[PDB]
Write a structure and sequence with these properties.
Length: about 100
RNA sequence: GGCAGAUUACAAUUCUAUUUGCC
């Protein structure tokens, strides 16, 4: 969250999306606040859904990255505590937990 | 860093890489 200046943080973490959600739907729900950054290697928007390895069901968790950091900040200020696909969600500032194994 | 084209491989439990052209 506010634990960093986020001057280099353009990603938000999301929880509660749903067990049947899609990258395109999440992107359509976040793009209305600001431009989601697009992958130039894959052409899909920067969203990463997560899955349970013990059940194979979706965690309801995902990251979304923005083309600018103030858009990510507005996305937290706005989407945090709203609903998506008919499910309550929770947005906040992300980091790179990937860096523990990358 | 961004824009266009091309290539290959792998992964997570909170932001992929390589490569050609241009600034």
């Amino acid at each position: 969250g506010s634990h960093m200046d986020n001057s280099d943080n353009n990603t938000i973490f999301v929880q509660g999306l749903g067990e049947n959600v899609t990258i395109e739907s999440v992107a359509d729900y976040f793009k209305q606040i600001g431009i989601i950054k697009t992958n130039k290697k894959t052409g899909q928007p920067m969203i990463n859904l997560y899955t349970d390895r013990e059940t194979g069901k979706l965690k309801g968790e995902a990251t979304v990255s923005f083309d600018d950091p103030p858009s990510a900040k507005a996305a937290i200020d706005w989407f945090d505590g709203k609903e998506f696909s008919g499910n309550p969600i929770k947005v906040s500032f992300a980091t790179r937990r990937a860096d523990f194994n990358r």
